[PDB]
Each structure stands twice: as structure tokens, then as C-alpha cells.
Amino acid sequence: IIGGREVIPHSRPYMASLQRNGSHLCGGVLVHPKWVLTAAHCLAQRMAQLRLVLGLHTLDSPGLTFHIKAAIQHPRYKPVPALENDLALLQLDGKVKPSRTIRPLALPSKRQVVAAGTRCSMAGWGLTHQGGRLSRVLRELDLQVLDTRMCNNSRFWNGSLSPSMVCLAADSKDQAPCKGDSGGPLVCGKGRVLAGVLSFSSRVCTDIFKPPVATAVAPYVSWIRKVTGRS
Structure with a gap:
């Protein structure tokens, strides 16, 4: 910003950081103990090396890190130069128990x-x-x-x-x-x-x-x- x-x-406490090799790429919102909503255009990436990091304030701090079980782009997503339906759901490889710092x-x-x-x-x-x-x-x-x-x-x-x-x-x-x-x-x-x-x-x-x-x-x-x- x-x-x-x-x-x-x-x-x-709903904020996610989508990262590749520890480098922040995009924001996200935790909307379910198992799911982060983000933009589809954020997933133009080598999926294996992506992580979701929850509970952050400072980026160079560990927070709580999840691997991604599934990356579900909206079925009608279209990319740039015709951007439409720009949403994706990422399923955490764990389940968030809500706390002070992490809550959907x-x-x-x-x-x-x-x-x-x-x-x-x-x-x-x-x-x-x-x-x-x-x-x-x-x-x-x-x-x-x-x-x-x-x-x-x-x-x-x-x-x-x-x-x-x-x-x-x-x-x-x-x-x-x-x-x-x-x-x-x-x-x-x-x-x-x-x-x-x-x-x-x-x-x-x-x-x-x-x-x-x-x-x-x-x-x-x-x-x-x-x-x-x-x-």
C-alpha cells in the first residue's frame, strides 16, 4: 500500500500472506478454518513452492505456516487482458483453531x-x-x-x-x-x-x-x- x-x-486476524520460497506474493482472507480466499491471478505460479502464512504483523516473523492441499480457481476465471472471475480458494493442509491472532x-x-x-x-x-x-x-x-x-x-x-x-x-x-x-x-x-x-x-x-x-x-x-x- x-x-x-x-x-x-x-x-x-483473518489476513493471509501467500508466499513462494518465503517471499510474499499476494494477500488473502481466511474464510473457513480450512480455506483462504485470494485472487485467481495470484496462482499463476509453481504451486508446490507456495505456502500460506497466518497470524502475521511483521513479514520477517514466522507466523503460522500451511502447505496448500488444493488450489481451486473459479471455473470461469479469465486472465489479463480479459480479467474476469478473479477469485481462487486455497485449502490449508491443516485446520485453524481460532485464536487472538488467527480467526476467519x-x-x-x-x-x-x-x-x-x-x-x-x-x-x-x-x-x-x-x-x-x-x-x-x-x-x-x-x-x-x-x-x-x-x-x-x-x-x-x-x-x-x-x-x-x-x-x-x-x-x-x-x-x-x-x-x-x-x-x-x-x-x-x-x-x-x-x-x-x-x-x-x-x-x-x-x-x-x-x-x-x-x-x-x-x-x-x-x-x-x-x-x-x-x-
């Missing part, structure tokens, strides 16, 4: 609407400057939901955002999620309810004409329930 704030440690975040109702003007936040260990390095510590950024139609304007996303995407704005031009933040959760409202999963970050993170986007979780809740086996 560029222009974000360090979080109070373990204040977001509840799925929203499948009827949940993420309306324009909604106040949300995201968290992640992604880059803190363009072309920079990952954050050593988990950071957060406030984001408000924008009107999708306005985000689809020819000067912005040029009609490419579907009803399943959440278009977002930080409070200033120089604050943005950045490489390493994608796959992490978007939480909204006073209730800090799970609302989306950050999709691909723009290469130029603060590109004013590419408002950051997250996939809405609600339209995928039935699929998440079918995969996790929890109705």
Missing part, C-alpha cells in the same frame, strides 16, 4: 450489495512506493466505493467493469494498493464486513485513470459454500 498506515498488530472472517450474505459511497478499507504488505519494496509490516488504507458507471467512463475503465466488480477510491491521488496487495480482503461499513477481494493492481499503482478494483464476494458466496462444503 502506498500512503497507508501500519495496522495495530493482529487487528485483522465471515462471508457476507449472498444478497449483499456494495453500494457507491460505502466506506471500506483494505490491508496488505504490498509495495509502499512505485518500483519499491514490500512493506515490512501490515498496513491499511481507507477506500470508498465509486459508482461503476462513472468508473466505466471512456477515460477510466472504458466499459470493462462488470456488475461483479467494486470500483474504489482512496482519499487522495497518492494513496493506493500496490504490487503484493492483490488477493487481500476489502472490508466495508461499521461492521467491517467482508465485501470484496482486491483484483490485479495497476502496474503504476497511483494511476488516477484506473481506480483500484476488487471482486465483490457476495455474487460468489454460493460457489464458495459449494467448494468448502459448508452451506
